[PDB]
Amino acid sequence: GGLRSLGRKILRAWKKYG
């Protein structure tokens, strides 16, 4: 997880925000 991947970090929705 990094700068440009930040979006795909959300995209994978591991825990999804909250």
Sign of CA dihedral 3, 8, 12, 17: positive
How far apart (Å, rounded) are the C-alpha atoms in residues 4 and 18? 21
Q: Using CA atoms, how far apart are residues 11 and 18, in angstroms rounded to an integer? A: 14
From residue 15, alpha-carbon distances to 5, 6, 9 in Å are 16, 14, 10
Dihedral sign computed on CA atoms, order 9, 5, 7, 18: positive
Helix (H) or strand (E) holding 6: helix 6-11
Find the helix or strand (DSSP H, E) in which 11 lies. Answer: helix 6-11
Residue 5, phi then psi, degrees to nearest 5? -80, -15
Q: How was this structure determined?
A: NMR
Q: Is the dihedral of CA 3, 17, 12, 14 positive or negative?
A: positive
